[PDB]
Amino acid sequence: IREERLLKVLRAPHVSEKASTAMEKSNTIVLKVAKDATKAEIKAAVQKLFEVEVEVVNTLVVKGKVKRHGQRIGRRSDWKKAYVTLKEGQNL
Amino acid sequence: AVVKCKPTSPGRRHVVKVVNPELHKGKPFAPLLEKNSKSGGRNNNGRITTRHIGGGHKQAYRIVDFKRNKDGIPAVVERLEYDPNRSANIALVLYKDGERRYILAPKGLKAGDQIQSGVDAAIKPGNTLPMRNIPVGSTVHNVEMKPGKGGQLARSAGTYVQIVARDGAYVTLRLRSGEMRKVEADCRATLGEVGNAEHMLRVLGKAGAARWRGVRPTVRGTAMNPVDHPHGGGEGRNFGKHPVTPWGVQTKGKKTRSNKRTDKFIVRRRS
Amino acid sequence: MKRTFQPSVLKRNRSHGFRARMATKNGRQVLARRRAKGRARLTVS
RNA sequence: AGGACCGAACCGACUAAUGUCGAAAAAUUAGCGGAUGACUUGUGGCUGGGGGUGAAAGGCCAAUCAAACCGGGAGAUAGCU
RNA sequence: GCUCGCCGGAAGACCAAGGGUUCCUGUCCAACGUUAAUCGGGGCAGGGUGAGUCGACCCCUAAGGCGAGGCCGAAAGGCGUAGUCGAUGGGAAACAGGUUAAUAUUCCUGUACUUGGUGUUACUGCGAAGGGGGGACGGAGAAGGCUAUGUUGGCCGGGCGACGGUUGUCCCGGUUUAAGCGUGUAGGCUGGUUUUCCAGGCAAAUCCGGAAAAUCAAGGCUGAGGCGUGAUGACGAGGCACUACGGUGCUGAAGCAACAAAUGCCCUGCUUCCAGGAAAAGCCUCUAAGCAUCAGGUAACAUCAAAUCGUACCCCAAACCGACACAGGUGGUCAGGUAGAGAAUACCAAGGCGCUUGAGAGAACUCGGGUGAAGGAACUAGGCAAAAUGGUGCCGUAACUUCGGGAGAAGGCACGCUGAUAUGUAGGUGAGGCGACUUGCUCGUGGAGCUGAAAUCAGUCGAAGAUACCAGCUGGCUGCAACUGUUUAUUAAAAACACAGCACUGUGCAAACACGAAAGUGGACGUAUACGGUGUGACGCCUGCCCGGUGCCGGGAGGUUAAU
Ligand SMILES: [Mg+2]
Ligand SMILES: [Mg+2]
Ligand SMILES: [Mg+2]
Ligand SMILES: [Mg+2]
Ligand SMILES: [Mg+2]
Ligand SMILES: [Mg+2]
Ligand SMILES: [Mg+2]
Ligand SMILES: [Mg+2]
Ligand SMILES: [Mg+2]
Ligand SMILES: [Mg+2]
Ligand SMILES: [Mg+2]
Ligand SMILES: [Mg+2]
Ligand SMILES: [Mg+2]
Ligand SMILES: [Mg+2]
Ligand SMILES: [Mg+2]
Ligand SMILES: [Mg+2]
Ligand SMILES: [Mg+2]
Ligand SMILES: [Mg+2]
Ligand SMILES: [Mg+2]
Ligand SMILES: [Mg+2]
Ligand SMILES: [Mg+2]
Ligand SMILES: [Mg+2]
Ligand SMILES: [Mg+2]
Ligand SMILES: [Mg+2]
Ligand SMILES: [Mg+2]
Ligand SMILES: [Mg+2]
Ligand SMILES: [Mg+2]
Ligand SMILES: [Mg+2]
Ligand SMILES: [Mg+2]
Ligand SMILES: [Mg+2]
Ligand SMILES: [Mg+2]
Ligand SMILES: [Mg+2]
Ligand SMILES: [Mg+2]
Ligand SMILES: [Mg+2]
Ligand SMILES: [Mg+2]
Ligand SMILES: [Mg+2]
Ligand SMILES: [Mg+2]
Ligand SMILES: [Mg+2]
Ligand SMILES: [Mg+2]
Ligand SMILES: [Mg+2]
Ligand SMILES: [Mg+2]
Ligand SMILES: [Mg+2]
Ligand SMILES: [Mg+2]
Ligand SMILES: [Mg+2]
Ligand SMILES: [Mg+2]
Ligand SMILES: [Mg+2]
Ligand SMILES: [Mg+2]
Ligand SMILES: [Mg+2]
Ligand SMILES: [Mg+2]
Ligand SMILES: [Mg+2]
Ligand SMILES: [Mg+2]
Ligand SMILES: [Mg+2]
Ligand SMILES: [Mg+2]
Ligand SMILES: [Mg+2]
Ligand SMILES: [Mg+2]
Ligand SMILES: [Mg+2]
Ligand SMILES: [Mg+2]
Ligand SMILES: [Mg+2]
Ligand SMILES: [Mg+2]
Ligand SMILES: [Mg+2]
Ligand SMILES: [Mg+2]
Ligand SMILES: [Mg+2]
Ligand SMILES: [Mg+2]
Ligand SMILES: [Mg+2]
Ligand SMILES: [Mg+2]
Ligand SMILES: [Mg+2]
Ligand SMILES: [Mg+2]
Ligand SMILES: [Mg+2]
Ligand SMILES: [Mg+2]
Ligand SMILES: [Mg+2]
Ligand SMILES: [Mg+2]
Ligand SMILES: [Mg+2]
Ligand SMILES: [Mg+2]
Ligand SMILES: [Mg+2]
Ligand SMILES: [Mg+2]
Ligand SMILES: [Mg+2]
Ligand SMILES: [Mg+2]
Ligand SMILES: [Mg+2]
Ligand SMILES: [Mg+2]
Ligand SMILES: [Mg+2]
Ligand SMILES: [Mg+2]
Ligand SMILES: [Mg+2]
Ligand SMILES: [Mg+2]
Ligand SMILES: [Mg+2]
Ligand SMILES: [Mg+2]
Ligand SMILES: [Mg+2]
Ligand SMILES: [Mg+2]
Ligand SMILES: [Mg+2]
Ligand SMILES: [Mg+2]
Ligand SMILES: [Mg+2]
Ligand SMILES: [Mg+2]
Ligand SMILES: [Mg+2]
Ligand SMILES: [Mg+2]
Ligand SMILES: [Mg+2]
Ligand SMILES: [Mg+2]
Ligand SMILES: [Mg+2]
Ligand SMILES: [Mg+2]
Ligand SMILES: [Mg+2]
Ligand SMILES: [Mg+2]
Ligand SMILES: [Mg+2]
Ligand SMILES: [Mg+2]
Ligand SMILES: [Mg+2]
Ligand SMILES: [Mg+2]
Ligand SMILES: [Mg+2]
Ligand SMILES: [Mg+2]
Ligand SMILES: [Mg+2]
Ligand SMILES: [Mg+2]
Ligand SMILES: [Mg+2]
Ligand SMILES: [Mg+2]
Ligand SMILES: [Mg+2]
Ligand SMILES: [Mg+2]
Ligand SMILES: [Mg+2]
Ligand SMILES: [Mg+2]
Ligand SMILES: [Mg+2]
Ligand SMILES: [Mg+2]
Ligand SMILES: [Mg+2]
Ligand SMILES: [Mg+2]
Ligand SMILES: [Mg+2]
Ligand SMILES: [Mg+2]
Ligand SMILES: [Mg+2]
Ligand SMILES: [Mg+2]
Ligand SMILES: [Mg+2]
Ligand SMILES: [Mg+2]
Ligand SMILES: [Mg+2]
Ligand SMILES: [Mg+2]
Ligand SMILES: [Mg+2]
Ligand SMILES: [Mg+2]
Ligand SMILES: [Mg+2]
Ligand SMILES: [Mg+2]
Ligand SMILES: [Mg+2]
Ligand SMILES: [Mg+2]
Ligand SMILES: [Mg+2]
Ligand SMILES: [Mg+2]
Ligand SMILES: [Mg+2]
Ligand SMILES: [Mg+2]
Ligand SMILES: [Mg+2]
Ligand SMILES: [Mg+2]
Ligand SMILES: [Mg+2]
Ligand SMILES: [Mg+2]
Ligand SMILES: [Mg+2]
Ligand SMILES: [Mg+2]
Ligand SMILES: [Mg+2]
Ligand SMILES: [Mg+2]
Ligand SMILES: [Mg+2]
Ligand SMILES: [Mg+2]
Ligand SMILES: [Mg+2]
Ligand SMILES: [Mg+2]
Ligand SMILES: [Mg+2]
Ligand SMILES: [Mg+2]
Ligand SMILES: [Mg+2]
Ligand SMILES: [Mg+2]
Ligand SMILES: [Mg+2]
Ligand SMILES: [Mg+2]
Ligand SMILES: [Mg+2]
Ligand SMILES: [Mg+2]
Ligand SMILES: [Mg+2]
Ligand SMILES: [Mg+2]
Ligand SMILES: [Mg+2]
Ligand SMILES: [Mg+2]
Ligand SMILES: [Mg+2]
Ligand SMILES: [Mg+2]
Ligand SMILES: [Mg+2]
Ligand SMILES: [Mg+2]
Ligand SMILES: [Mg+2]
Ligand SMILES: [Mg+2]
Ligand SMILES: [Mg+2]
Ligand SMILES: [Mg+2]
Ligand SMILES: [Mg+2]
Ligand SMILES: [Mg+2]
Ligand SMILES: [Mg+2]
Ligand SMILES: [Mg+2]
Ligand SMILES: [Mg+2]
Ligand SMILES: [Mg+2]
Ligand SMILES: [Mg+2]
Ligand SMILES: [Mg+2]
Ligand SMILES: [Mg+2]
Ligand SMILES: [Mg+2]
Ligand SMILES: [Mg+2]
Ligand SMILES: [Mg+2]
Ligand SMILES: [Mg+2]
Ligand SMILES: [Mg+2]
Ligand SMILES: [Mg+2]
Ligand SMILES: [Mg+2]
Ligand SMILES: [Mg+2]
Ligand SMILES: [Mg+2]
Ligand SMILES: [Mg+2]
Ligand SMILES: [Mg+2]
Ligand SMILES: [Mg+2]
Ligand SMILES: [Mg+2]
Ligand SMILES: [Mg+2]
Ligand SMILES: [Mg+2]
Ligand SMILES: [Mg+2]
Ligand SMILES: [Mg+2]
Ligand SMILES: [Mg+2]
Ligand SMILES: [Mg+2]
Ligand SMILES: [Mg+2]
Ligand SMILES: [Mg+2]
Ligand SMILES: [Mg+2]
Ligand SMILES: [Mg+2]
Ligand SMILES: [Mg+2]
Ligand SMILES: [Mg+2]
Ligand SMILES: [Mg+2]
Ligand SMILES: [Mg+2]
Ligand SMILES: [Mg+2]
Ligand SMILES: [Mg+2]
Ligand SMILES: [Mg+2]
Ligand SMILES: [Mg+2]
Ligand SMILES: [Mg+2]
Ligand SMILES: [Mg+2]
Ligand SMILES: [Mg+2]
Ligand SMILES: [Mg+2]
Ligand SMILES: [Mg+2]
Ligand SMILES: [Mg+2]
Ligand SMILES: [Mg+2]
Ligand SMILES: [Mg+2]
Ligand SMILES: [Mg+2]
Ligand SMILES: [Mg+2]
Ligand SMILES: [Mg+2]
Ligand SMILES: [Mg+2]
Ligand SMILES: [Mg+2]
Ligand SMILES: [Mg+2]
Ligand SMILES: [Mg+2]
Ligand SMILES: [Mg+2]
Ligand SMILES: [Mg+2]
Ligand SMILES: [Mg+2]
Ligand SMILES: [Mg+2]
Ligand SMILES: [Mg+2]
Ligand SMILES: [Mg+2]
Ligand SMILES: [Mg+2]
Ligand SMILES: [Mg+2]
Ligand SMILES: [Mg+2]
Ligand SMILES: [Mg+2]
Ligand SMILES: [Mg+2]
Ligand SMILES: [Mg+2]
Ligand SMILES: [Mg+2]
Ligand SMILES: [Mg+2]
Ligand SMILES: [Mg+2]
Ligand SMILES: [Mg+2]
Ligand SMILES: [Mg+2]
Ligand SMILES: [Mg+2]
Ligand SMILES: [Mg+2]
Ligand SMILES: [Mg+2]
Ligand SMILES: [Mg+2]
Ligand SMILES: [Mg+2]
Ligand SMILES: [Mg+2]
Ligand SMILES: [Mg+2]
Ligand SMILES: [Mg+2]
Ligand SMILES: [Mg+2]
Ligand SMILES: [Mg+2]
Ligand SMILES: [Mg+2]
Ligand SMILES: [Mg+2]
Ligand SMILES: [Mg+2]
Ligand SMILES: [Mg+2]
Ligand SMILES: [Mg+2]
Ligand SMILES: [Mg+2]
Ligand SMILES: [Mg+2]
Ligand SMILES: [Mg+2]
Ligand SMILES: [Mg+2]
Ligand SMILES: [Mg+2]
Ligand SMILES: [Mg+2]
Ligand SMILES: [Mg+2]
Ligand SMILES: [Mg+2]
Ligand SMILES: [Mg+2]
Ligand SMILES: [Mg+2]
Ligand SMILES: [Mg+2]
Ligand SMILES: [Mg+2]
Ligand SMILES: [Mg+2]
């Protein structure tokens, strides 16, 4: 079910307070995904790579901040994060 | 009846309404209705071709039957209705077979009366016949200029054509203008006079009445500046030029008929 | 107090957008010009 | 019933004062007119420059109008400063 | 932190548009901030936007746009047909509570619902580029039934007075709960069926339309609400608990009744009027081309699914439009108390703010206000400006009139508070009862409580009782314009424009005329009781003479007369 490509979806685990509070209490994992990456493709990726029972994936697109570097203005890249809820069989 | 309105307000004072009691108080027959969106007097190019039109009340088109294609089928008049896109009233005719159509209501007509149309039929108001079969010296309306077509002449309230003479294939008609026109005898004509003759006795009474009829204000040439209209300028109410349209063609007695094709059919021009 | 610029992104793009310029021969020459001059913002988009 | 009456919202702009390098390239304060209609307003269309639109003032058409704006002819032309 | 002040139909709370990180935390004050700044919408890091149900995308269309062929046009290209786009409109479904420093109808808990695929199964005619139905519609008005919401009792927990009183008719606080599902009411709307038959709805139809009937009188449809579940729940005023004086984490009582009441909802309804009030899909239904154990429908237990994008924050503003942290502009939604007719106004609640230079002094003069002896328009171009009048009820109200008006003419009088009539009245209002009528959200008594004007009479205080805010100045003669309306955005609002009405005139429909090299469009899906142009400008009384001149119209002999 969409082999090879699934590996390119998940970029990194997200580190934050909101990310931490949703580990123990809500039983989810926040993580940075590819700008494409549908909820099915994230779920299916977590199901094989991380190998845990996924309840549901909620997804959102974060907009890049407009920073500075003296004169030349620059905008950061629009990355996409995925709150992935897990089932009772959880770990990481 | 033609009821004058009481002067409870300036603007009401001069109002004179044409209150027809027989008309239907209710929504019309939907299958014959369709949309009729307004132009505002502008065309393809989006420009005012005809001035002084715009706004007014929204109004739906009733598909009125000018052709009268049903031959030898009787038809009962179900109810008379108000038509907002027309001077005359209309009658919801129910054909014996099942069909319903709107027609222009003639004078002597009510909810219940029977109408037949075709070749034979009877000589009576409302019945549509070819002008060959119709007796000479008789009042008709909704007259076709071309056989098989709709019905062009005398469709306005109280309007009627009189058949003067009958020269073989042609029929000489005296029209409401005073013009005597020669049409083909095969063309049809609905017998009698078009109803709602009181229409012209209506007097609106206020500016707003014309506005909600879709008319906009006419500004006199003389009021304008010379750049705008041939009558124009002057320091305080001048004129001193011959009356003319905004495009300089003379009005006020200046023949603009120039068809040439149809001049053969016109027996005698109006006066 | 009711100024000339009353912004609307739909109107903006319908009036001055890339496709609105692409629709017409005169509009394609505008783009041709901005490209020739070498602009970054070829149209408002 | 009403282009009816009084009167808030809303739309307007009659008078006065202030302001006039303003708080504001047209406003404020106190009064003022319309306020179910020819009303008002949101959103989206259409009309293009001798052209539009104009209940007509030469009004309005992006703070520009007896002929918009931008580029070009173009270093127009100037018996004038 | 405690006072004080201000807004409160906003200066509060949600949005759309538009912005585009301005949101939150930590840190830093060079510049930015009209002053200082430890603070900041500033700098710099990091964090923050979680959807089958909200919106967008998606199915459908209006105005309009584009437009295969096509018609038209020196070229460019214009118009437009089948189509395809285009919301500001139509079309499936989720709520209450809890939660973050920053999101929540999206996370969480408890309850729900909606459309699909693929099954399973019993049962069966399905099937359109097609027909019919529905969607599906205006203004105004009126009335009833409701609800949001409030108020007052009861009830429950606390209180016993910083200064005389206060164990009470006393004081403070609370009295909350949704979609869903069940119920089908106040009420709206409609004669049901059953059979046959028929030149109609381009074909076909059992559907729609029409025509016979026969036959019981109702059967459907729509619908607020309320009640019952939802809800041994949720929540709940204080307590306790701990203190990192941030709060963390435990419980948690009553949790009712009457009255009042919308501009909300039934009502897309009803009555009425004319100026006569989108479209198209979803939806329901009928059959053609077909298909006939079939595929297809129908139902029911499943099951799998419901992708993508927006979601922070401002949003009458220091974040949008105005060059500014600008005394301007900016669409929708929510609408608490007391007084009041009220969304006016005053004072307040929720909630939010004190407008990013202050401190003194208390000259002239300027600005915005208050008061003023005697006089009272003598000012001045002009009562400009100020002052004054102002509410409700009742009495009264002239010429003139188009018979409506004028008219709120004018001008008067009464208004507070307290008892009484009446331990709160007519009125509204409805309970425990009791007929009964059946199965009800019943009819009709019945009138316990709450609610409550307006009066009259008698007292009574003040200088003044519509005591504040709020809230006409009035009359006479007269020019112009009938009137409401429109107008020089930014020195002119008028007698100017428009106007209903009036006349002349053109126009016989491939209409005149207008836009357009043209095709073609408007006029008009109109047809002389119509349409265009011109002037005049309600209404009443009228509108006189001149056709030499200029135009226009008609006439065709004669003169002159181009191209050929
Ligand atoms: Mg769920
Ligand atoms: Mg979820
Ligand atoms: Mg999302
Ligand atoms: Mg964002
Ligand atoms: Mg980038
Ligand atoms: Mg980065
Ligand atoms: Mg890059
Ligand atoms: Mg109706
Ligand atoms: Mg048309
Ligand atoms: Mg065009
Ligand atoms: Mg076009
Ligand atoms: Mg156009
Ligand atoms: Mg015209
Ligand atoms: Mg006209
Ligand atoms: Mg019409
Ligand atoms: Mg006129
Ligand atoms: Mg006029
Ligand atoms: Mg004219
Ligand atoms: Mg004038
Ligand atoms: Mg003028
Ligand atoms: Mg001229
Ligand atoms: Mg003049
Ligand atoms: Mg003169
Ligand atoms: Mg003269
Ligand atoms: Mg001339
Ligand atoms: Mg012309
Ligand atoms: Mg001329
Ligand atoms: Mg700009
Ligand atoms: Mg806009
Ligand atoms: Mg535009
Ligand atoms: Mg009025
Ligand atoms: Mg106000
Ligand atoms: Mg206002
Ligand atoms: Mg506004
Ligand atoms: Mg305004
Ligand atoms: Mg003024
Ligand atoms: Mg103004
Ligand atoms: Mg006033
Ligand atoms: Mg006002
Ligand atoms: Mg008035
Ligand atoms: Mg008023
Ligand atoms: Mg009024
Ligand atoms: Mg009215
Ligand atoms: Mg617009
Ligand atoms: Mg234009
Ligand atoms: Mg011209
Ligand atoms: Mg031109
Ligand atoms: Mg002038
Ligand atoms: Mg020019
Ligand atoms: Mg010029
Ligand atoms: Mg220029
Ligand atoms: Mg030069
Ligand atoms: Mg040259
Ligand atoms: Mg206050
Ligand atoms: Mg309020
Ligand atoms: Mg806020
Ligand atoms: Mg919020
Ligand atoms: Mg929201
Ligand atoms: Mg939002
Ligand atoms: Mg900006
Ligand atoms: Mg936004
Ligand atoms: Mg920044
Ligand atoms: Mg700190
Ligand atoms: Mg700090
Ligand atoms: Mg410092
Ligand atoms: Mg430094
Ligand atoms: Mg430093
Ligand atoms: Mg600074
Ligand atoms: Mg500073
Ligand atoms: Mg602060
Ligand atoms: Mg900070
Ligand atoms: Mg902040
Ligand atoms: Mg910050
Ligand atoms: Mg900052
Ligand atoms: Mg820096
Ligand atoms: Mg750091
Ligand atoms: Mg870093
Ligand atoms: Mg959801
Ligand atoms: Mg969605
Ligand atoms: Mg959910
Ligand atoms: Mg939401
Ligand atoms: Mg939705
Ligand atoms: Mg999408
Ligand atoms: Mg093409
Ligand atoms: Mg092809
Ligand atoms: Mg082509
Ligand atoms: Mg042709
Ligand atoms: Mg071509
Ligand atoms: Mg074209
Ligand atoms: Mg075009
Ligand atoms: Mg086209
Ligand atoms: Mg095809
Ligand atoms: Mg089309
Ligand atoms: Mg399509
Ligand atoms: Mg479409
Ligand atoms: Mg929409
Ligand atoms: Mg919308
Ligand atoms: Mg919609
Ligand atoms: Mg829907
Ligand atoms: Mg929608
Ligand atoms: Mg819904
Ligand atoms: Mg909903
Ligand atoms: Mg927030
Ligand atoms: Mg909720
Ligand atoms: Mg969950
Ligand atoms: Mg469920
Ligand atoms: Mg379901
Ligand atoms: Mg299946
Ligand atoms: Mg199935
Ligand atoms: Mg089987
Ligand atoms: Mg069938
Ligand atoms: Mg079928
Ligand atoms: Mg179908
Ligand atoms: Mg509608
Ligand atoms: Mg209506
Ligand atoms: Mg309306
Ligand atoms: Mg009315
Ligand atoms: Mg009315
Ligand atoms: Mg009542
Ligand atoms: Mg009653
Ligand atoms: Mg009742
Ligand atoms: Mg209630
Ligand atoms: Mg209320
Ligand atoms: Mg109240
Ligand atoms: Mg009390
Ligand atoms: Mg006690
Ligand atoms: Mg004491
Ligand atoms: Mg005591
Ligand atoms: Mg209380
Ligand atoms: Mg309370
Ligand atoms: Mg309850
Ligand atoms: Mg619901
Ligand atoms: Mg259900
Ligand atoms: Mg039921
Ligand atoms: Mg029932
Ligand atoms: Mg029902
Ligand atoms: Mg049922
Ligand atoms: Mg009944
Ligand atoms: Mg048939
Ligand atoms: Mg055909
Ligand atoms: Mg049958
Ligand atoms: Mg039938
Ligand atoms: Mg209910
Ligand atoms: Mg119910
Ligand atoms: Mg309810
Ligand atoms: Mg309960
Ligand atoms: Mg219990
Ligand atoms: Mg609790
Ligand atoms: Mg608590
Ligand atoms: Mg409990
Ligand atoms: Mg309990
Ligand atoms: Mg009540
Ligand atoms: Mg009530
Ligand atoms: Mg009501
Ligand atoms: Mg209202
Ligand atoms: Mg409301
Ligand atoms: Mg309604
Ligand atoms: Mg089978
Ligand atoms: Mg099957
Ligand atoms: Mg299940
Ligand atoms: Mg299921
Ligand atoms: Mg499943
Ligand atoms: Mg899907
Ligand atoms: Mg928000
Ligand atoms: Mg706000
Ligand atoms: Mg505000
Ligand atoms: Mg608002
Ligand atoms: Mg605000
Ligand atoms: Mg700004
Ligand atoms: Mg500017
Ligand atoms: Mg600017
Ligand atoms: Mg400031
Ligand atoms: Mg401001
Ligand atoms: Mg300010
Ligand atoms: Mg304003
Ligand atoms: Mg809006
Ligand atoms: Mg509302
Ligand atoms: Mg209030
Ligand atoms: Mg009150
Ligand atoms: Mg107020
Ligand atoms: Mg206060
Ligand atoms: Mg407060
Ligand atoms: Mg408070
Ligand atoms: Mg605020
Ligand atoms: Mg504060
Ligand atoms: Mg302060
Ligand atoms: Mg400050
Ligand atoms: Mg100071
Ligand atoms: Mg001193
Ligand atoms: Mg002083
Ligand atoms: Mg001194
Ligand atoms: Mg001084
Ligand atoms: Mg000064
Ligand atoms: Mg002073
Ligand atoms: Mg002053
Ligand atoms: Mg005073
Ligand atoms: Mg003073
Ligand atoms: Mg004074
Ligand atoms: Mg004095
Ligand atoms: Mg004194
Ligand atoms: Mg005195
Ligand atoms: Mg005196
Ligand atoms: Mg005097
Ligand atoms: Mg004197
Ligand atoms: Mg004097
Ligand atoms: Mg003097
Ligand atoms: Mg004088
Ligand atoms: Mg004067
Ligand atoms: Mg004055
Ligand atoms: Mg005084
Ligand atoms: Mg005063
Ligand atoms: Mg005073
Ligand atoms: Mg007073
Ligand atoms: Mg009085
Ligand atoms: Mg009164
Ligand atoms: Mg009188
Ligand atoms: Mg007199
Ligand atoms: Mg009278
Ligand atoms: Mg008088
Ligand atoms: Mg009277
Ligand atoms: Mg009086
Ligand atoms: Mg009086
Ligand atoms: Mg008078
Ligand atoms: Mg009082
Ligand atoms: Mg008493
Ligand atoms: Mg009582
Ligand atoms: Mg009583
Ligand atoms: Mg009752
Ligand atoms: Mg009982
Ligand atoms: Mg009693
Ligand atoms: Mg009784
Ligand atoms: Mg009582
Ligand atoms: Mg007394
Ligand atoms: Mg007394
Ligand atoms: Mg006292
Ligand atoms: Mg006394
Ligand atoms: Mg008194
Ligand atoms: Mg007073
Ligand atoms: Mg008054
Ligand atoms: Mg006189
Ligand atoms: Mg004089
Ligand atoms: Mg005189
Ligand atoms: Mg006069
Ligand atoms: Mg006038
Ligand atoms: Mg006159
Ligand atoms: Mg005006
Ligand atoms: Mg205007
Ligand atoms: Mg104006
Ligand atoms: Mg001006
Ligand atoms: Mg000017
Ligand atoms: Mg004026
Ligand atoms: Mg002025
Ligand atoms: Mg007039
Ligand atoms: Mg006449
Ligand atoms: Mg051309
Ligand atoms: Mg032609
Ligand atoms: Mg045509
Ligand atoms: Mg049409
Ligand atoms: Mg005529
Ligand atoms: Mg005039
Ligand atoms: Mg005149
Ligand atoms: Mg007259
Ligand atoms: Mg006369
Ligand atoms: Mg002569
Ligand atoms: Mg002639
Ligand atoms: Mg002639
Ligand atoms: Mg001649």
Beta strands in B10-112 (DSSP E): 16-18, 33-34, 61-62, 75-81, 90-95, 100-104
CB atoms within 10 A of CB B252: 8
Hey, what are C4's tokens? 């000339």
* CATH code for the domain defined by B195-271: 4.10.950.10
Distance CA B202, CA B124 (A): 29
Q: Is B268 helix (H, G, I), strand (E, B) or coil?
A: strand
Approach to solving = cryo-EM
**CA nearest to B32, candidates B100, B109, B134, B106:** B100
Compute the distance between CA of residue C2 and CA of residue B269 in angstroms, rounded to an integer.
59
Q: Which helix (H) or strand (E) holds B118?
A: none
Q: What are the residue ranges of helices labelled H in chain B?
A: 207-211
Return the ∠ at Cα B134 (arms to B129 and B140), rounded to 5°.
75
Name the E strands within chain C.
none
Neighbours of B208 (CB within 10 A): 10
- Which residue is the nearest neighbor of D45, CA to C1'? C11
Strands B128-130 and B139-141: unpaired
Structure token pair of residue B53: 């039109």
Q: How remote is the CA of residue B193 from the centroid of ligand 259, in Å?
A: 20
Beta bridge partners of B167: B170
Cα B198 to chain center, whole Å? 14
CATH topology of domain B1-113: OB fold (Dihydrolipoamide Acetyltransferase, E2P) (2.40.50)
Q: Does the CB of B236 sit below 7 A from strand D?
A: no
Give whole-number Cα distances, B130 to B13, B96, B117, C32, in Å: 47, 21, 10, 67
The domain segmentation of chain B, as residue ranges, is: 1-113, 117-194, 195-271
User: Which alpha helices (H) appear in A3-86, and where do they start and end?
Assistant: 17-24, 39-45
Dihedral (CA of B149, B152, B158, B162) sign = negative
Task: Print burial letters for B103-130: b (CB count within 10 Å at least 16), e (below 16).
Answer: bbbbbebeeebebbbbeebeeebbbbbb
Cα gap B185→B145, rounded to integer Å: 10
CA of B177 to C1' of E528 (A): 6
How many whole angstroms separate alpha carbon B43 and alpha carbon B63?
A: 23
Please state the φ and ψ torsions of residue C33, each to the nearest 5 degrees.
Answer: -60, -55
Nucleotide nearest to B246 (CA to C1'): E533
CA–C1' gap, C38 and E27, in angstroms: 43
If phi > 0 it is left, if psi is from -120 to 50 it is alpha, else beta; for residue B41 that is: left
The nucleotides of chain D lying under 7 Å from a protein CB are 1-4, 24, 26-27, 37-39, 43-48, 52-58, 62-63, 66-67
Q: Which is nearest to B35 in space by CA: B18, B17, B58?
A: B58
For residue A19, say whether its CB is under 7 Å from any atom of strand E. yes
**For A80 and E519, how far is CA from C1' in angstroms?**
56
Cα B26 to Cα B80: distance, rounded to the nearest angstrom: 11
- β-partners of residue B61 are B34
Nucleotide nearest to B252 (CA to C1'): E505
Q: Which of B51, B66, B59 is nearest to B83 (CA)?
A: B59
Query: How many Å from the CA of B213 to C1' of E335?
Result: 40
User: What does the CA dihedral B215, B219, B221, B222 come to, rounded to 10 degrees?
Assistant: 150
Contact in structure between B75 and B115 (CB atoms under 8 Å): yes
Tokens in use for B14?
Answer: 């001069």
> Virtual CA dihedral for B106, B107, B109, B110, nearest 10 degrees?
120
- The helix, strand and coil proportions of chain A, stated in percent and rounded to the nearest 5, come to 25, 30, 40
Q: Please tell me the distance from the alpha carbon of residue A91 to that of residue A77, in angstroms, as a whole number.
A: 31
Structural tokens at position B263: 């001049």
* Nearest nucleic acid nucleotide to A66, CA to C1' distance: E21
Whether B68 contacts B128, CB under 8 Å: yes
Q: What is the DSSP string of B127-195?
A: -EEETTTSPSS-EEESB-SSTTS---BS-STT--EEEEEEETTEEEEE-TTS-EEEEETTSEEEES-BS
Q: A35: which residues sit within 8 A by CB, 6+ positions away?
A: A61, A78, A79, A80
Partners of B139 in the β-ladder? B162
Token couple for B160: 């009627």
**Distance from CA of residue A20 to its chain's centroid?**
14
Write out the two tokens for A90.
Answer: 């959880």
Q: Under a CB-based contact definition with an 8 Å cutoff, are residues B158 and B210 in contact?
A: no
How many Å apart are CA B183 and CA B130, to the nearest integer?
11
State how far the Cα of B184 lies from the Cα of B145, in Å rounded to an integer: 7
Q: For CA atoms B203, B206, B212, B213, give the dihedral sign.
A: positive
| Residue bearing tokens 């094709």 | B261
CA distances from B97 to A35, B36, B75 (A): 68, 29, 9
Identity (one letter) of the amino acid at C11? K
Nearest to B193 by CA among B74, B92, B105: B105
Q: Residues B82, B23: contact at Cβ < 8 Å?
A: yes
